[PDB]
């Protein structure tokens, strides 16, 4: 009697859930701003 390697029931579908209607982060607009700071006064922006 041979106990074979364990199998797992393969998925039949995929569930993808995200919050809808969120705005674009516009990260490139902030990174491409022409007023570039020096390392001494580095600027920060938070995207959420």
């Amino acid at each position: 009697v041979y106990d074979l390697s364990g199998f797992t029931v393969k998925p039949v579908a995929t569930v993808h859930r995200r919050i809808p209607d969120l705005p674009d982060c516009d990260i490139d607009k902030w990174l491409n701003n022409f007023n570039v700071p020096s390392p001494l006064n580095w600027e920060r922006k938070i995207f959420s």
Binding site: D3, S5, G6, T8
Partner: protein, 48 residues
């Protein structure tokens, strides 16, 4: 011994007492799929 006779307590009445004793002769037959235990179904883990 007094006059070659010793004092001894001899029973005059009795009963039958029962004492149970469990002796383990078996145990649960644990089987482990080492592949499924170590790596659930992750191909990257089964490769390593």
């Amino acid at each position: 011994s007094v006059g070659g006779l010793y004092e001894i307590k001899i029973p005059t009445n009795f009963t039958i007492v029962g004492q149970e004793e469990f002796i383990q002769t078996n145990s649960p037959k644990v089987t482990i799929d080492c592949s499924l235990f170590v790596c659930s179904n992750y191909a990257a883990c089964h490769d390593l």
